[PDB]
Amino acid sequence: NPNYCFAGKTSSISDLKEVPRKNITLIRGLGHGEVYEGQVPLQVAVKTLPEVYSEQDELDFLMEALIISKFNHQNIVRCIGVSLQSLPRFILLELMAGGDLKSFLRETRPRPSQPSSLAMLDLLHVARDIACGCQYLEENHFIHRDIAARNCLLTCPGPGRVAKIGDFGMARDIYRGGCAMLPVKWMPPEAFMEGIFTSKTDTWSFGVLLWEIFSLGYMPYPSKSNQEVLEFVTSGGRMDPPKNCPGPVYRIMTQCWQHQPEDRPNFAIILERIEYCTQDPDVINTALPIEY
Numbered sequence: 001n002p003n004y005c006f007a008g009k010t011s012s013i014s015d016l017k018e019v020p021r022k023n024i025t026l027i028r029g030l031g032h033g034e035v036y037e038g039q040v041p042l043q044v045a046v047k048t049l050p051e052v053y054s055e056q057d058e059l060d061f062l063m064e065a066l067i068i069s070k071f072n073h074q075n076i077v078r079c080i081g082v083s084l085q086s087l088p089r090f091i092l093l094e095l096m097a098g099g100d101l102k103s104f105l106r107e108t109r110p111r112p113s114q115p116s117s118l119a120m121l122d123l124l125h126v127a128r129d130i131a132c133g134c135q136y137l138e139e140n141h142f143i144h145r146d147i148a149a150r151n152c153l154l155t156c157p158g159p160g161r162v163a164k165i166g167d168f169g170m171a172r173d174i175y176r177g178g179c180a181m182l183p184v185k186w187m188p189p190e191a192f193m194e195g196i197f198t199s200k201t202d203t204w205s206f207g208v209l210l211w212e213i214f215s216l217g218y219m220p221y222p223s224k225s226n227q228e229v230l231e232f233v234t235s236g237g238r239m240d241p242p243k244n245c246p247g248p249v250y251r252i253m254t255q256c257w258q259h260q261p262e263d264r265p266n267f268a269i270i271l272e273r274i275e276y277c278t279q280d281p282d283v284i285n286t287a288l289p290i291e292y
């Protein structure tokens with residue numbers, strides 16, 4: 001079985017915690033590979049590998065398990081273990097009842113009925129949570145390559161929610177796809193032009209995630225296609241502030257999108273700037289838009 005290296009240690013599939021299949025019960029689908037709520041009782045999310053998939057898909061599936069299993073940080077989803085000795089293969093993950101961040105933002109947008117569903121501080125806390133996860137990845141020399149709202153999860157819907165990075169499929173592929181599937185709208189110029197990835201790649205992507213968060217779940221670069229975005233960004237074009245976005249928050253975005261990677265902040269600096277935003281009453285007392 002293939003090996004994987006993280007921090008100072010090397011690992012293989014034999015190192016994955018095998019959970020006996022008989023101890024695992026599926027409860028319900030969680031919007032689908034497919035994903036289920038399961039019990040081991042320990043409440044888990046079950047990621048399945050379709051049996052009709054290929055040997056390569058098999059290897060990618062296991063590699064993702066290895067990757068997540070080796071992280072240890074509060075803002076990265078935990079891997080409970082795996083069930084690889086029976087078909088279909090399972091990966092067992094921390095159950096994140098709040099679901100993915102993009103869906104959460106879109107479904108929890110403040111309304112005339114629920115105008116106080118979300119406030120600016122909630123959004124800043126989500127941003128801080130994911131930045132803390134990104135800082136951990138940066139300091140351990142791991143490049144995610146696809147930081148985006150769709151790949152972040154929430155522990156729960158309500159106020160105590162914690163956001164975590166949940167999906168590592170892109171980093172898995174590169175570790176061992178088509179052009180139209182590349183997340184170009186989250187990528188800096190040196191990434192989509194030269195295939196160069198560094199931690200400053202993730203900084204750029206985080207800026208786009210910030211826009212996703214403060215837009216309350218809009219697709220980046222409204223009305224633009226991938227190729228149009230490629231030309232737009234290469235020429236110096238950047239997104240406008242989301243509706244009602246505080247200047248200090250938009251400033252973090254535009255720093256994340258500096259053309260030269262050396263001019264973009266690392267995640268320690270991003271975290272400091274997010275923290276300052278949470279301290280500023282003029283920022284956190286800003287009302288979010290209410291869609292009618």
Ligand SMILES: C[C@@H](Oc1cc(-c2cnn(C3CCNCC3)c2)cnc1N)c1c(Cl)ccc(F)c1Cl
Nearest residue numbers: 030045093094095096097098099100151152166167
């Ligand atoms: C693989 C899958 O895992 C989970 C999905 C979910 C999930 C998705 N949707 N929901 C809904 C369940 C019903 N209540 C609203 C959320 C829960 C929770 N925890 C997980 N570990 C997943 C998905 Cl489906 C999407 C993005 C991710 F980053 C990840 Cl890691």
